Amino acid sequence: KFPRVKNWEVGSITYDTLSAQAQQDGPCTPRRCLGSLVFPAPEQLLSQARDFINQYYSSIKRSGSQAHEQRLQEVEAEVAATGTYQLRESELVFGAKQAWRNAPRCVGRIQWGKLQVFDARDCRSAQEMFTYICNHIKYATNRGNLRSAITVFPQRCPGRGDFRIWNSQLVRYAGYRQQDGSVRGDPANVEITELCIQHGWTPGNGRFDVLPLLLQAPDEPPELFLLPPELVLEVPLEHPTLEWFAALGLRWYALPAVSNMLLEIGGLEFPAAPFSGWYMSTEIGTRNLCDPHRYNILEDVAVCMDLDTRTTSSLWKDKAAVEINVAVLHSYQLAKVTIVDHHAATASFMKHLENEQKARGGCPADWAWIVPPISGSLTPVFHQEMVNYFLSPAFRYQPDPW
Amino acid sequence: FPRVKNWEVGSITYDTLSAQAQQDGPCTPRRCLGSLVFPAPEQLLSQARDFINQYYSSIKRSGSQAHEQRLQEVEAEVAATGTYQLRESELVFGAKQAWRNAPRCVGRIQWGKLQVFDARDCRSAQEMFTYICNHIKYATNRGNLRSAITVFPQRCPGRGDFRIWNSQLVRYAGYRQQDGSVRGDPANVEITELCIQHGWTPGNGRFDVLPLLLQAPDEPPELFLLPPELVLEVPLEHPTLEWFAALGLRWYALPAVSNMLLEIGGLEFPAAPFSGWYMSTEIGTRNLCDPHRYNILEDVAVCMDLDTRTTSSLWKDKAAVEINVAVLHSYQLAKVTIVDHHAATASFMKHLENEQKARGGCPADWAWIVPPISGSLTPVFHQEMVNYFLSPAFRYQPDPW
Ligand code: HEM
Ligand code: HEM
Ligand SMILES: Cc1cc(N)nc(CCc2c(F)c(F)cc(CCCN(C)C)c2F)c1
Ligand SMILES: Cc1cc(N)nc(CCc2c(F)c(F)cc(CCCN(C)C)c2F)c1
Ligand SMILES: Cc1cc(N)nc(CCc2c(F)c(F)cc(CCCN(C)C)c2F)c1
Ligand SMILES: Cc1cc(N)nc(CCc2c(F)c(F)cc(CCCN(C)C)c2F)c1
Ligand SMILES: [Gd]
Ligand SMILES: [Gd]
Ligand SMILES: [Gd]
Ligand SMILES: [Gd]
Ligand SMILES: [Zn+2]
């Protein structure tokens, strides 16, 4: 009664029993599939808590024990007396790892069990928030030997404002609009750049200016904090055999650190809980450097390669893109900054799929996001059927706080 | 009505065509199964009536007394015999719509230009083979390829069906080996075993064109040898890598799918081979580079002097891109029609804009429309799509063995 899932490179077949536990409705119906869309309390808070507690006690191999029975009753009574309830730190750690493990669009999930979870739930001010973030950046960067981490700020609560990081990531490059409708710098960040300026930031004019953080303590206006440049590790981009590539003057930063998603665990919501790992090379070379609405260097590189850019059948776009990705991988390895190419990353996601089939009966996976944006069918994930569903704990999108 | 966004531009459309989705797909609100490869007299009449109504709607003849007479003819036919037969123009319109409705086809900008060969009077496997040979000749057209479909008799209760046991009309032999491996195309090992067990003396080359197994109702399937100059082939050479020709690679001009079932107005055609022209990545990326096909990536990378030790040299991506260059160049040099994935996805974007005005949407399967290399360099990548099943349609069907 469960979905049959085939790998078409090998012929293997598995059945995803985990999808029965799907705690939320997606956008597809038997009459049309919407899987390609980018963006699709009392006895309700309570139902999510019990399910989360069941998961926790299963993970420590104590399902049904007296302590399991007691914590369920204990949470049930803290809800009634207060509305909300508090996670034990061991449950917070487990729940943050689970949100990662559950995230269908992440190809990096082989690593999910080795996340460092920093407990910032006692944080009181924006200044304290900045200190926690700097500690996160320092630990995760680790001089180039990057380590996965998450810092979880206090949960949302009635009677108190939310903690929020206004930036979409901890490290972002400014984007300044030019006369001729072009963006100097990263065009994706034109908006947050406006807000940093309007809140006191002295802007620069480079193509790679690191933005300040806009931090929001409860019921406060957001506060501006400049990142110390010794904290933000960057990589100059160069090509192992095209010496003119270095004269493009391109760079990227080491640490991908998403700061605008909401973390949900057992009914509780943490609207500021930034997390970081390390980059897959296609995110920098193909999306960030090549997209027409980002840095959009593809044709420039093609011309330097002396490719015929007037006819698509030369595959000049395809050739220039591969070489930009080669440059990214070479440059991170040269600078001794962790990076994974899309062949390694997808090979490890296949191992994750095997692991999860044993451990839980399946794995939620969003095929269109797991398959890299270049060379899709040259990777094993392309030939793997996948089932997409929502499990909690989860990372969720949330509205901009402005 | 689902809201559909293009993320490169920011434009929005609403798909109102999906409301008329006849069948049910694999997905539910609790889990999406969109990546899955394979998802009664009153029944026939209701589909027949729906299709007849579609036909007269498209020619602006809804309600007219010709529309009424046709509906009555089907009512009487199905009452008498449990089935009915299509008029010639209905057949042609049904074949075009089935192509137009195919969510996985990126070449649908061409949907209005389709040659339809009516073979519904076919009597034998020998006659079927004659019809197939005419199709290949018309469709190949000295390399100036023309889209075409030939339709054999409808199925019916009782007697067996006309089937083409080959998945395509042109397929290279796959030879299961004395030592485990495969010689030729590994995707055709099953069908190659069946041709041997029906009296084909096999070859031992990597590109041996298979015979066609053709089967008349209840009568058995019989082998048929294809004339060697009916089947056009393109030797693969590279524009600047002179050693590429020494690999002895080739491919055939005509992609001709012979194993799908055509469904029009409740009737079903188990034998209705259709053909178009190749998108280069189909040959260069899937057929030659898939590890379960010819799997040439490493051999090409070694000839390119690339570092195959570690994946972070991107030797796979470089070799694949040059194989696709060689395909495009070799088909262009040989004057055989081919389209590269950039031009095909550009035309599918225009197709999506055409279909929005005409029908209020367009069913499209994102994972099959995005090309297998350089996906995000093509305009379809940043385009949300809605997948749903309209009729008339091409559908899969079980193997005849
Ligand atoms: C450690 C190495 C990691 C790798 C290689 C990796 C890789 C990726 C990639 C390639 C994407 C899709 C981005 C795109 O398509 O443009 C993604 C998304 C995502 N990742 Fe991972 N990631 C890593 C670490 C983490 C960590 C530590 C977390 C959370 C604790 C996480 C959670 C997510 C989530 C929630 C998404 C979806 C983001 C969205 O939809 O906006 N990842 N990841
Ligand atoms: C004329 C130029 C054509 C081009 C460039 C083209 C291209 C393609 C491509 C690239 C695919 C996906 C192949 C794959 O993913 O392996 C496809 C699928 C498909 N096309 Fe077209 N095609 C053309 C003509 C036709 C014609 C003439 C018909 C029918 C009358 C047709 C009907 C279909 C169907 C039913 C599928 C789905 C096959 C499947 O799901 O396995 N196409 N086409
Ligand atoms: C922890 C981590 C490690 C890693 N290697 N990569 C990431 C990338 C996450 C991420 C972005 F950073 C981004 F800018 C854009 C997207 C897609 C769109 C976002 N959403 C609005 C639909 C995205 F998924 C995260
Ligand atoms: C269907 C699909 C599959 C897949 N794998 N990836 C994507 C990424 C698409 C995408 C986003 F998701 C997004 F948040 C933002 C943008 C740019 C917005 C431009 N504008 C703000 C200047 C974008 F193009 C789409
Ligand atoms: C008319 C036409 C023109 C053109 N350019 N390409 C085609 C390709 C159709 C097609 C094949 F022929 C094939 F062998 C294999 C597949 C993959 C799916 C396998 N299917 C059994 C699930 C495929 F999509 C058809
Ligand atoms: C997910 C996805 C997306 C997309 N766009 N294309 C595909 C094509 C994959 C595919 C097939 F569809 C197929 F029918 C047969 C094979 C080989 C099987 C041979 N093996 C059993 C002996 C295959 F690899 C898959
Ligand atoms: Gd104050
Ligand atoms: Gd050089
Ligand atoms: Gd008749
Ligand atoms: Gd040499
Ligand atoms: Zn779906």
PDB file of N, CA, C and O in Angstrom, chain A residues 8-9 20 22 25-26 28 30-33 36 38 286 312-313 318 323 333 341-343 373 375-377 383 385-386 388-389, chain B residues 7 24-25 27-32 35 37 285-286 290-291 311-312 317-318 340-342 372 374-376 384-385 387-388:
ATOM      1  N   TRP A   8      16.853   3.326 -11.683  1.00  0.00           N
ATOM      2  CA  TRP A   8      16.827   2.916 -13.075  1.00  0.00           C
ATOM      3  C   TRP A   8      18.211   2.623 -13.638  1.00  0.00           C
ATOM      4  O   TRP A   8      18.315   2.008 -14.705  1.00  0.00           O
ATOM      5  N   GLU A   9      19.264   3.022 -12.932  1.00  0.00           N
ATOM      6  CA  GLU A   9      20.618   2.623 -13.287  1.00  0.00           C
ATOM      7  C   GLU A   9      20.913   1.180 -12.875  1.00  0.00           C
ATOM      8  O   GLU A   9      21.727   0.509 -13.519  1.00  0.00           O
ATOM      9  N   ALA A  20       4.030   7.463   5.198  1.00  0.00           N
ATOM     10  CA  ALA A  20       2.755   7.375   5.903  1.00  0.00           C
ATOM     11  C   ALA A  20       2.700   8.349   7.079  1.00  0.00           C
ATOM     12  O   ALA A  20       1.638   8.908   7.380  1.00  0.00           O
ATOM     13  N   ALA A  22       3.587  11.282   7.138  1.00  0.00           N
ATOM     14  CA  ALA A  22       3.669  12.636   6.600  1.00  0.00           C
ATOM     15  C   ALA A  22       2.737  13.551   7.379  1.00  0.00           C
ATOM     16  O   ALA A  22       1.511  13.434   7.283  1.00  0.00           O
ATOM     17  N   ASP A  25       0.319  18.443   4.555  1.00  0.00           N
ATOM     18  CA  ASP A  25      -0.151  18.272   3.191  1.00  0.00           C
ATOM     19  C   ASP A  25       0.696  19.091   2.222  1.00  0.00           C
ATOM     20  O   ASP A  25       0.996  20.263   2.478  1.00  0.00           O
ATOM     21  N   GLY A  26       1.075  18.469   1.113  1.00  0.00           N
ATOM     22  CA  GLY A  26       1.786  19.150   0.053  1.00  0.00           C
ATOM     23  C   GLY A  26       0.807  19.698  -0.966  1.00  0.00           C
ATOM     24  O   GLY A  26      -0.409  19.641  -0.773  1.00  0.00           O
ATOM     25  N   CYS A  28       0.250  18.787  -4.297  1.00  0.00           N
ATOM     26  CA  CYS A  28      -0.190  17.949  -5.403  1.00  0.00           C
ATOM     27  C   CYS A  28      -1.517  17.261  -5.083  1.00  0.00           C
ATOM     28  O   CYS A  28      -1.824  16.984  -3.927  1.00  0.00           O
ATOM     29  N   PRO A  30      -4.280  14.035  -6.929  1.00  0.00           N
ATOM     30  CA  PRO A  30      -4.336  13.028  -8.006  1.00  0.00           C
ATOM     31  C   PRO A  30      -4.653  13.611  -9.379  1.00  0.00           C
ATOM     32  O   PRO A  30      -4.407  12.937 -10.390  1.00  0.00           O
ATOM     33  N   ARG A  31      -5.159  14.840  -9.464  1.00  0.00           N
ATOM     34  CA  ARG A  31      -5.457  15.410 -10.768  1.00  0.00           C
ATOM     35  C   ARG A  31      -4.358  16.309 -11.319  1.00  0.00           C
ATOM     36  O   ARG A  31      -4.364  16.584 -12.525  1.00  0.00           O
ATOM     37  N   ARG A  32      -3.411  16.766 -10.499  1.00  0.00           N
ATOM     38  CA  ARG A  32      -2.268  17.479 -11.066  1.00  0.00           C
ATOM     39  C   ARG A  32      -1.129  17.548 -10.054  1.00  0.00           C
ATOM     40  O   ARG A  32      -1.360  17.708  -8.860  1.00  0.00           O
ATOM     41  N   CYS A  33       0.102  17.411 -10.540  1.00  0.00           N
ATOM     42  CA  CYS A  33       1.287  17.447  -9.693  1.00  0.00           C
ATOM     43  C   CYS A  33       1.873  18.850  -9.724  1.00  0.00           C
ATOM     44  O   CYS A  33       2.077  19.414 -10.802  1.00  0.00           O
ATOM     45  N   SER A  36       6.937  20.938  -8.889  1.00  0.00           N
ATOM     46  CA  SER A  36       7.936  21.879  -9.385  1.00  0.00           C
ATOM     47  C   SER A  36       7.846  23.264  -8.743  1.00  0.00           C
ATOM     48  O   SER A  36       8.776  24.064  -8.908  1.00  0.00           O
ATOM     49  N   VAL A  38       8.238  26.395  -6.431  1.00  0.00           N
ATOM     50  CA  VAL A  38       9.289  26.759  -5.488  1.00  0.00           C
ATOM     51  C   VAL A  38       8.713  26.990  -4.086  1.00  0.00           C
ATOM     52  O   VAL A  38       9.229  26.465  -3.093  1.00  0.00           O
ATOM     53  N   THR A 286      27.668  27.642 -10.789  1.00  0.00           N
ATOM     54  CA  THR A 286      26.568  27.594 -11.740  1.00  0.00           C
ATOM     55  C   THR A 286      25.450  28.555 -11.366  1.00  0.00           C
ATOM     56  O   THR A 286      25.025  29.361 -12.193  1.00  0.00           O
ATOM     57  N   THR A 312      24.120  28.562 -30.666  1.00  0.00           N
ATOM     58  CA  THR A 312      24.003  27.729 -29.469  1.00  0.00           C
ATOM     59  C   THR A 312      24.617  26.350 -29.681  1.00  0.00           C
ATOM     60  O   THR A 312      25.087  25.731 -28.717  1.00  0.00           O
ATOM     61  N   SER A 313      24.624  25.855 -30.921  1.00  0.00           N
ATOM     62  CA  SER A 313      25.118  24.510 -31.202  1.00  0.00           C
ATOM     63  C   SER A 313      26.620  24.369 -30.981  1.00  0.00           C
ATOM     64  O   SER A 313      27.120  23.241 -30.994  1.00  0.00           O
ATOM     65  N   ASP A 318      27.685  25.642 -22.263  1.00  0.00           N
ATOM     66  CA  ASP A 318      28.029  24.440 -21.515  1.00  0.00           C
ATOM     67  C   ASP A 318      29.516  24.400 -21.195  1.00  0.00           C
ATOM     68  O   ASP A 318      29.910  24.040 -20.076  1.00  0.00           O
ATOM     69  N   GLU A 323      34.070  25.146 -17.021  1.00  0.00           N
ATOM     70  CA  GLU A 323      35.353  25.717 -16.618  1.00  0.00           C
ATOM     71  C   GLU A 323      35.216  26.636 -15.407  1.00  0.00           C
ATOM     72  O   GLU A 323      36.139  26.692 -14.589  1.00  0.00           O
ATOM     73  N   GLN A 333      40.130  24.175  -3.091  1.00  0.00           N
ATOM     74  CA  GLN A 333      41.138  23.203  -2.680  1.00  0.00           C
ATOM     75  C   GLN A 333      42.481  23.880  -2.465  1.00  0.00           C
ATOM     76  O   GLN A 333      43.179  23.583  -1.490  1.00  0.00           O
ATOM     77  N   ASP A 341      32.370  18.490  -4.778  1.00  0.00           N
ATOM     78  CA  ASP A 341      31.828  18.637  -6.125  1.00  0.00           C
ATOM     79  C   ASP A 341      30.509  17.862  -6.244  1.00  0.00           C
ATOM     80  O   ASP A 341      30.142  17.062  -5.372  1.00  0.00           O
ATOM     81  N   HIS A 342      29.781  18.089  -7.347  1.00  0.00           N
ATOM     82  CA  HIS A 342      28.450  17.488  -7.431  1.00  0.00           C
ATOM     83  C   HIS A 342      28.490  15.976  -7.637  1.00  0.00           C
ATOM     84  O   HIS A 342      27.506  15.298  -7.326  1.00  0.00           O
ATOM     85  N   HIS A 343      29.601  15.412  -8.132  1.00  0.00           N
ATOM     86  CA  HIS A 343      29.675  13.958  -8.207  1.00  0.00           C
ATOM     87  C   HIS A 343      29.835  13.339  -6.820  1.00  0.00           C
ATOM     88  O   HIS A 343      29.203  12.319  -6.513  1.00  0.00           O
ATOM     89  N   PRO A 373      22.405  21.423 -10.861  1.00  0.00           N
ATOM     90  CA  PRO A 373      21.915  22.225 -11.989  1.00  0.00           C
ATOM     91  C   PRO A 373      22.760  22.115 -13.255  1.00  0.00           C
ATOM     92  O   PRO A 373      22.375  22.687 -14.281  1.00  0.00           O
ATOM     93  N   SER A 375      24.987  18.896 -15.527  1.00  0.00           N
ATOM     94  CA  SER A 375      25.411  17.504 -15.617  1.00  0.00           C
ATOM     95  C   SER A 375      24.505  16.569 -14.828  1.00  0.00           C
ATOM     96  O   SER A 375      24.981  15.579 -14.262  1.00  0.00           O
ATOM     97  N   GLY A 376      23.201  16.883 -14.807  1.00  0.00           N
ATOM     98  CA  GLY A 376      22.262  16.115 -14.007  1.00  0.00           C
ATOM     99  C   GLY A 376      22.402  14.619 -14.181  1.00  0.00           C
ATOM    100  O   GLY A 376      22.593  13.891 -13.206  1.00  0.00           O
ATOM    101  N   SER A 377      22.322  14.132 -15.430  1.00  0.00           N
ATOM    102  CA  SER A 377      22.265  12.691 -15.643  1.00  0.00           C
ATOM    103  C   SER A 377      23.624  12.007 -15.508  1.00  0.00           C
ATOM    104  O   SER A 377      23.688  10.773 -15.541  1.00  0.00           O
ATOM    105  N   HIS A 383      18.858   9.107 -11.834  1.00  0.00           N
ATOM    106  CA  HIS A 383      18.205   7.849 -12.165  1.00  0.00           C
ATOM    107  C   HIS A 383      17.521   7.217 -10.964  1.00  0.00           C
ATOM    108  O   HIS A 383      17.103   6.054 -11.041  1.00  0.00           O
ATOM    109  N   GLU A 385      14.369   7.273  -8.490  1.00  0.00           N
ATOM    110  CA  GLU A 385      13.046   7.796  -8.189  1.00  0.00           C
ATOM    111  C   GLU A 385      13.010   8.242  -6.729  1.00  0.00           C
ATOM    112  O   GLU A 385      13.701   7.681  -5.873  1.00  0.00           O
ATOM    113  N   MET A 386      12.245   9.301  -6.454  1.00  0.00           N
ATOM    114  CA  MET A 386      12.207   9.881  -5.114  1.00  0.00           C
ATOM    115  C   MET A 386      10.775  10.245  -4.729  1.00  0.00           C
ATOM    116  O   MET A 386       9.926  10.505  -5.586  1.00  0.00           O
ATOM    117  N   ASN A 388       8.565  12.829  -2.206  1.00  0.00           N
ATOM    118  CA  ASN A 388       8.667  14.098  -1.499  1.00  0.00           C
ATOM    119  C   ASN A 388       7.483  14.253  -0.549  1.00  0.00           C
ATOM    120  O   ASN A 388       6.326  14.181  -0.975  1.00  0.00           O
ATOM    121  N   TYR A 389       7.775  14.478   0.732  1.00  0.00           N
ATOM    122  CA  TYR A 389       6.740  14.681   1.740  1.00  0.00           C
ATOM    123  C   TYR A 389       7.354  15.462   2.888  1.00  0.00           C
ATOM    124  O   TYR A 389       8.574  15.542   3.015  1.00  0.00           O
TER     125      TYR A 389
ATOM    126  N   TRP B   7      10.744  32.207 -12.763  1.00  0.00           N
ATOM    127  CA  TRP B   7      11.612  32.817 -11.767  1.00  0.00           C
ATOM    128  C   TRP B   7      12.744  33.634 -12.370  1.00  0.00           C
ATOM    129  O   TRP B   7      13.383  34.410 -11.646  1.00  0.00           O
ATOM    130  N   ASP B  24      -6.218  10.268 -13.246  1.00  0.00           N
ATOM    131  CA  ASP B  24      -5.596  10.581 -11.968  1.00  0.00           C
ATOM    132  C   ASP B  24      -4.129  10.175 -12.004  1.00  0.00           C
ATOM    133  O   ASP B  24      -3.791   9.080 -12.467  1.00  0.00           O
ATOM    134  N   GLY B  25      -3.264  11.066 -11.531  1.00  0.00           N
ATOM    135  CA  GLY B  25      -1.846  10.802 -11.481  1.00  0.00           C
ATOM    136  C   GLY B  25      -1.455  10.134 -10.178  1.00  0.00           C
ATOM    137  O   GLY B  25      -2.309   9.733  -9.376  1.00  0.00           O
ATOM    138  N   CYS B  27       0.201  11.395  -7.467  1.00  0.00           N
ATOM    139  CA  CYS B  27       0.437  12.184  -6.264  1.00  0.00           C
ATOM    140  C   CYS B  27      -0.834  12.322  -5.428  1.00  0.00           C
ATOM    141  O   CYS B  27      -1.954  12.184  -5.932  1.00  0.00           O
ATOM    142  N   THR B  28      -0.646  12.574  -4.133  1.00  0.00           N
ATOM    143  CA  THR B  28      -1.697  12.926  -3.188  1.00  0.00           C
ATOM    144  C   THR B  28      -1.228  14.126  -2.376  1.00  0.00           C
ATOM    145  O   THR B  28      -0.070  14.538  -2.479  1.00  0.00           O
ATOM    146  N   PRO B  29      -2.112  14.736  -1.574  1.00  0.00           N
ATOM    147  CA  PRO B  29      -1.650  15.828  -0.700  1.00  0.00           C
ATOM    148  C   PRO B  29      -0.552  15.414   0.269  1.00  0.00           C
ATOM    149  O   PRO B  29       0.217  16.277   0.706  1.00  0.00           O
ATOM    150  N   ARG B  30      -0.448  14.132   0.619  1.00  0.00           N
ATOM    151  CA  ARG B  30       0.554  13.721   1.596  1.00  0.00           C
ATOM    152  C   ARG B  30       1.920  13.400   0.991  1.00  0.00           C
ATOM    153  O   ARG B  30       2.926  13.571   1.681  1.00  0.00           O
ATOM    154  N   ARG B  31       2.007  12.938  -0.259  1.00  0.00           N
ATOM    155  CA  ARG B  31       3.327  12.754  -0.861  1.00  0.00           C
ATOM    156  C   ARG B  31       3.273  12.913  -2.376  1.00  0.00           C
ATOM    157  O   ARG B  31       2.340  12.443  -3.034  1.00  0.00           O
ATOM    158  N   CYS B  32       4.284  13.592  -2.916  1.00  0.00           N
ATOM    159  CA  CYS B  32       4.406  13.799  -4.351  1.00  0.00           C
ATOM    160  C   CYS B  32       5.226  12.659  -4.933  1.00  0.00           C
ATOM    161  O   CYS B  32       6.285  12.313  -4.397  1.00  0.00           O
ATOM    162  N   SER B  35       8.375  12.166  -9.679  1.00  0.00           N
ATOM    163  CA  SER B  35       9.588  11.647 -10.302  1.00  0.00           C
ATOM    164  C   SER B  35       9.454  10.195 -10.744  1.00  0.00           C
ATOM    165  O   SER B  35      10.383   9.667 -11.366  1.00  0.00           O
ATOM    166  N   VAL B  37       8.905   7.097 -12.925  1.00  0.00           N
ATOM    167  CA  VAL B  37       8.959   6.928 -14.376  1.00  0.00           C
ATOM    168  C   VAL B  37       7.623   6.415 -14.906  1.00  0.00           C
ATOM    169  O   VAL B  37       7.037   6.999 -15.824  1.00  0.00           O
ATOM    170  N   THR B 285      24.241  12.469 -24.419  1.00  0.00           N
ATOM    171  CA  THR B 285      24.319  12.314 -22.974  1.00  0.00           C
ATOM    172  C   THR B 285      23.690  11.012 -22.498  1.00  0.00           C
ATOM    173  O   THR B 285      24.315  10.270 -21.736  1.00  0.00           O
ATOM    174  N   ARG B 286      22.467  10.701 -22.939  1.00  0.00           N
ATOM    175  CA  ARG B 286      21.821   9.501 -22.422  1.00  0.00           C
ATOM    176  C   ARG B 286      22.342   8.239 -23.113  1.00  0.00           C
ATOM    177  O   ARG B 286      22.791   7.297 -22.453  1.00  0.00           O
ATOM    178  N   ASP B 290      25.295   7.311 -20.454  1.00  0.00           N
ATOM    179  CA  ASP B 290      24.671   6.634 -19.318  1.00  0.00           C
ATOM    180  C   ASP B 290      25.514   5.415 -18.946  1.00  0.00           C
ATOM    181  O   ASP B 290      25.901   4.641 -19.834  1.00  0.00           O
ATOM    182  N   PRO B 291      25.805   5.197 -17.659  1.00  0.00           N
ATOM    183  CA  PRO B 291      26.634   4.040 -17.279  1.00  0.00           C
ATOM    184  C   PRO B 291      25.997   2.709 -17.612  1.00  0.00           C
ATOM    185  O   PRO B 291      26.704   1.696 -17.697  1.00  0.00           O
ATOM    186  N   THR B 311      37.015  12.949  -8.972  1.00  0.00           N
ATOM    187  CA  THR B 311      35.861  13.553  -9.623  1.00  0.00           C
ATOM    188  C   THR B 311      35.936  15.068  -9.664  1.00  0.00           C
ATOM    189  O   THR B 311      35.249  15.682 -10.489  1.00  0.00           O
ATOM    190  N   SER B 312      36.771  15.683  -8.829  1.00  0.00           N
ATOM    191  CA  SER B 312      36.779  17.140  -8.760  1.00  0.00           C
ATOM    192  C   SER B 312      37.508  17.789  -9.933  1.00  0.00           C
ATOM    193  O   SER B 312      37.472  19.019 -10.045  1.00  0.00           O
ATOM    194  N   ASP B 317      32.125  15.884 -16.731  1.00  0.00           N
ATOM    195  CA  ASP B 317      31.390  16.978 -17.362  1.00  0.00           C
ATOM    196  C   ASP B 317      32.072  17.435 -18.643  1.00  0.00           C
ATOM    197  O   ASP B 317      31.403  17.818 -19.606  1.00  0.00           O
ATOM    198  N   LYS B 318      33.408  17.440 -18.665  1.00  0.00           N
ATOM    199  CA  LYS B 318      34.111  17.886 -19.864  1.00  0.00           C
ATOM    200  C   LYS B 318      33.946  16.885 -20.998  1.00  0.00           C
ATOM    201  O   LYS B 318      33.675  17.265 -22.143  1.00  0.00           O
ATOM    202  N   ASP B 340      19.897  21.166 -30.751  1.00  0.00           N
ATOM    203  CA  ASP B 340      20.620  21.163 -29.489  1.00  0.00           C
ATOM    204  C   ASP B 340      19.685  21.592 -28.354  1.00  0.00           C
ATOM    205  O   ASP B 340      18.655  22.226 -28.582  1.00  0.00           O
ATOM    206  N   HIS B 341      20.064  21.252 -27.115  1.00  0.00           N
ATOM    207  CA  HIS B 341      19.122  21.420 -26.005  1.00  0.00           C
ATOM    208  C   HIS B 341      18.805  22.889 -25.737  1.00  0.00           C
ATOM    209  O   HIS B 341      17.722  23.197 -25.215  1.00  0.00           O
ATOM    210  N   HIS B 342      19.695  23.812 -26.123  1.00  0.00           N
ATOM    211  CA  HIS B 342      19.395  25.230 -25.926  1.00  0.00           C
ATOM    212  C   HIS B 342      18.293  25.700 -26.865  1.00  0.00           C
ATOM    213  O   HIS B 342      17.365  26.405 -26.456  1.00  0.00           O
ATOM    214  N   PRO B 372      19.343  16.863 -19.727  1.00  0.00           N
ATOM    215  CA  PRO B 372      20.172  16.128 -18.760  1.00  0.00           C
ATOM    216  C   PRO B 372      21.581  16.678 -18.564  1.00  0.00           C
ATOM    217  O   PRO B 372      22.298  16.180 -17.682  1.00  0.00           O
ATOM    218  N   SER B 374      23.591  20.661 -18.283  1.00  0.00           N
ATOM    219  CA  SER B 374      23.460  22.113 -18.331  1.00  0.00           C
ATOM    220  C   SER B 374      22.016  22.553 -18.084  1.00  0.00           C
ATOM    221  O   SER B 374      21.527  23.501 -18.700  1.00  0.00           O
ATOM    222  N   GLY B 375      21.325  21.841 -17.188  1.00  0.00           N
ATOM    223  CA  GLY B 375      19.922  22.137 -16.938  1.00  0.00           C
ATOM    224  C   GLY B 375      19.658  23.607 -16.670  1.00  0.00           C
ATOM    225  O   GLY B 375      18.856  24.245 -17.358  1.00  0.00           O
ATOM    226  N   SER B 376      20.376  24.185 -15.710  1.00  0.00           N
ATOM    227  CA  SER B 376      20.037  25.537 -15.284  1.00  0.00           C
ATOM    228  C   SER B 376      20.537  26.603 -16.241  1.00  0.00           C
ATOM    229  O   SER B 376      20.223  27.780 -16.040  1.00  0.00           O
ATOM    230  N   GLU B 384       8.334  27.129 -13.424  1.00  0.00           N
ATOM    231  CA  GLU B 384       7.436  26.184 -12.783  1.00  0.00           C
ATOM    232  C   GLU B 384       6.493  25.593 -13.826  1.00  0.00           C
ATOM    233  O   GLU B 384       6.160  26.232 -14.827  1.00  0.00           O
ATOM    234  N   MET B 385       6.107  24.337 -13.618  1.00  0.00           N
ATOM    235  CA  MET B 385       5.259  23.624 -14.562  1.00  0.00           C
ATOM    236  C   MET B 385       4.238  22.806 -13.787  1.00  0.00           C
ATOM    237  O   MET B 385       4.424  22.493 -12.608  1.00  0.00           O
ATOM    238  N   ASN B 387       2.026  19.213 -14.053  1.00  0.00           N
ATOM    239  CA  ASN B 387       1.909  17.941 -14.749  1.00  0.00           C
ATOM    240  C   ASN B 387       0.510  17.362 -14.532  1.00  0.00           C
ATOM    241  O   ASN B 387       0.034  17.289 -13.394  1.00  0.00           O
ATOM    242  N   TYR B 388      -0.147  16.980 -15.632  1.00  0.00           N
ATOM    243  CA  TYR B 388      -1.472  16.372 -15.585  1.00  0.00           C
ATOM    244  C   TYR B 388      -1.729  15.680 -16.920  1.00  0.00           C
ATOM    245  O   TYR B 388      -1.061  15.956 -17.918  1.00  0.00           O
TER     246      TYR B 388
END
